[PDB]
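In practice, a research group might receive sequence data for several interacting partners and want a quick structural hypothesis before committing to experiments. The following worked case mirrors that situation: the sequences arrive first, and a predicted assembly follows.
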Amino acid sequence: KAGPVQVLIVKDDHSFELDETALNRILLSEAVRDKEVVAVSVAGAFRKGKSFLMDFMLRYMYNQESVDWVGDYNEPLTGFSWRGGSERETTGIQIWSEIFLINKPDGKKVAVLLMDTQGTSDSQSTLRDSATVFALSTMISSIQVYNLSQNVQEDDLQHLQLFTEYGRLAMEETFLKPFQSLIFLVRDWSFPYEFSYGADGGAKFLEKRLKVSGNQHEELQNVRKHIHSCFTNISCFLLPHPGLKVATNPNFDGKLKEIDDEFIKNLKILIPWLLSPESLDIKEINGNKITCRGLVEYFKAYIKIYQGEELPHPKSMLQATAEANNLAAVATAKDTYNKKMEEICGGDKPFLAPNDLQTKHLQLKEESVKLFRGVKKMGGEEFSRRYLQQLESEIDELYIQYIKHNDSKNI
Amino acid sequence: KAGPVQVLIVKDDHSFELDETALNRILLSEAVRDKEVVAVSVAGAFRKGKSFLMDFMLRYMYNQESVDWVGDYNEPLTGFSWRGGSERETTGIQIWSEIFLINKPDGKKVAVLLMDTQGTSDSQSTLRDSATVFALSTMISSIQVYNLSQNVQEDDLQHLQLFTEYGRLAMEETFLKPFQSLIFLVRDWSFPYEFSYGADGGAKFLEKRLKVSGNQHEELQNVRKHIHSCFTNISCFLLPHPGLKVATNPNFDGKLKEIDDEFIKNLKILIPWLLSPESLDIKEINGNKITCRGLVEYFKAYIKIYQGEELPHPKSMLQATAEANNLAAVATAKDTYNKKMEEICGGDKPFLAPNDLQTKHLQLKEESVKLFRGVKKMGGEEFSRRYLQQLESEIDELYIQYIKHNDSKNIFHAARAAALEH
Ligand SMILES: Nc1nc2c(ncn2[C@@H]2O[C@H](COP(=O)(O)OP(=O)(O)O)[C@@H](O)[C@H]2O)c(=O)[nH]1
Ligand SMILES: Nc1nc2c(ncn2[C@@H]2O[C@H](COP(=O)(O)OP(=O)(O)O)[C@@H](O)[C@H]2O)c(=O)[nH]1
Ligand code: ALF
Ligand code: ALF
Ligand SMILES: [Mg+2]
Ligand SMILES: [Mg+2]
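A structural hypothesis for the assembly, expressed as tokens:
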């Protein structure tokens, strides 16, 4: 019997593990391994109904040819594990064990893979944990549902930009856009009188939100340009709140009779708009359509890159800013020392007595140390200590170079 | 008649202006200028009901002595401007024009100032805009209500850390904690079966969410340690959802008869909890209690700092990581060039003829450029181009230093060569 399968395992030590056996068993079966694959993912902040949504996607995938695929209104919602409570439920990445075979309007018979992910920003996860899951699901899926709550905030765009860039870094160089379809799914949209629920309201909302204009600040322009650069198709769907019973009742188990009717009405539109045979886009990587067997190889390849240390680590805004502040200050203090030493023992300056050279070096070292300390930096003085010691060590190294330059002028 | 007053203005070119005349008219009047001041602010992500909340705080401030301060159930909600719609309403910082005089259980009157702020992360603002508003409002307030939606996510704590770090950087150095009281107010809390609505469930939720353990990953540890070290008192209040009429009905105008009853009950706990005379903390800066006139002086000083450019610029995760990646690659590549040039024209090495020196320099410069370009960095090759150009420029400057070092080993080379050619 079909069920969810844990394929990306996140460990308590923040390491990642691919369950290759379970993955090979689902995607290398004879019926699917050679078919071109459509991979649908949902990702975004944790505790926002992602697994819940995926389980309605499952109902549609099993009952496409039925007018009432949304189900019996007394049927509980099953599949991927979903629940209330403040603590995360999904970890890593899970896929549905049954690969769906669908006929496109082309006549092409394609394999459809459904992928559910650990929400970002939970209380147990580093930024590297969250970015790796989100980048991997974007790199593997051909349709990425970016699940957002209520609105699209500038920090939603900055996270998307960080995660997609992290994905790009693990990918081979390419002249085409790295990714395919992205849907901004806005849950609990509260303003249907400003933009109607659904795809047409969402398209107008998103055009406004992502619009680049010349009078816009560069920081605002650049995040929008980066998002457009990454995806060949970007859509948006505004979804109503499903009712306070769905959000707050601990006995709720997914029965449609307990879900707000306007939510159901739009949910019935959203799922086929995402998953109908005409809207299923086959996965492509660097301009080649991928089969299920091909997808398995890329999954293994990408995880290995993220398991190693070839790529830089994503860092928080304060941590990354502190590091850049300190690196820039080291460079400035070191450059100051170099140019000041050139004034007293550059090539065109006379030989200096060794004791004089030492006195002037110690003075110029102290001046560069005071320059470094005086620059305002994020992170605090304790964070700076490592960079202060590096600075002093590199200046001491430079000094020995100058001892030898000076010595050459008295031979 | 009393109303909201814009005191911090964010311009469309993202510059900041203090309307000192408006501020002075309010805080320097004879009635309040010399009274110790309590400042209450609300701040957080945009479009989350901050102004709405403040107008219910206004009702309390005006009707504390009335039996039913919350208002008639048919009375619309007014004061600071609030509304639905997805676009921001409040910009900058505004204060209420009427300063409330309140007697403490001690015996003398404090002045209470209410401050409403632009939500962070709206689509028209830079990170620096958001950071400056949130920092200024934290630095000026003695009670900061941090307004959050549904949960406390790790990105919420990273933003609070960044914003409070930005405020600390603009303050006088002190051995004391820089700020006083912080309230994590969680709107639309959905799990009362796990942590009950209000301040006791909030305290248990927040104690767990903010707990510092020496065994958590340093990234999670250090955010929590930072927040704890910034505030002398941190609490948390979990508020129910107000109902879909409040959230989605365009005709809603604040009438209590259209607000869910459980939200009202907790609202009636929250507001006196925040504002009761025995709960009002007098603003302290650098160990001194502050009067209204002193608060104006600090508002002027702090904004002057953020109007200048003495401080590091707040940057997005991608922007800051890309910068750090490129800065490190530049330093490595420049260091390599220096070390390789020392092998050939260090002080203890023989004179090199200018043509050999140039050829070797050009080889080593290319190897360093190749090293820089080979480093995997966030942000793209296009982002790195400013740093590649800077590296080539700094390498060229070092080369000229080496030309002079080398020439000094044989000043007569060109002259003697010319004399020997004959
Ligand atoms: N407010 C709100 N809650 C939802 C929605 N959809 C599902 N939920 C509830 O969200 C909670 C967590 O759902 P889950 O799918 O496990 O979230 P995930 O962690 O994002 O996968 C459950 O209590 C769901 O009933 C929605 O559209 N809005
Ligand atoms: N979901 C929800 N909406 C609220 C709450 N409080 C107020 N609102 C609605 O949120 C919208 C924005 O309110 P406003 O005070 O202008 O938000 P601000 O931008 O943060 O100041 C209004 O439509 C309010 O009716 C709440 O606790 N939960
Ligand atoms: F909180 Al989750 F899937 F994002 F359980
Ligand atoms: F969006 Al606001 F006050 F944060 F109008
Ligand atoms: Mg889930
Ligand atoms: Mg407001």
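Before designing any experiment, note the following. The first strand of chain A starts at residue 4 and ends at 10. The CA atoms of residues 183 and 235 of chain A lie 5 Å apart.
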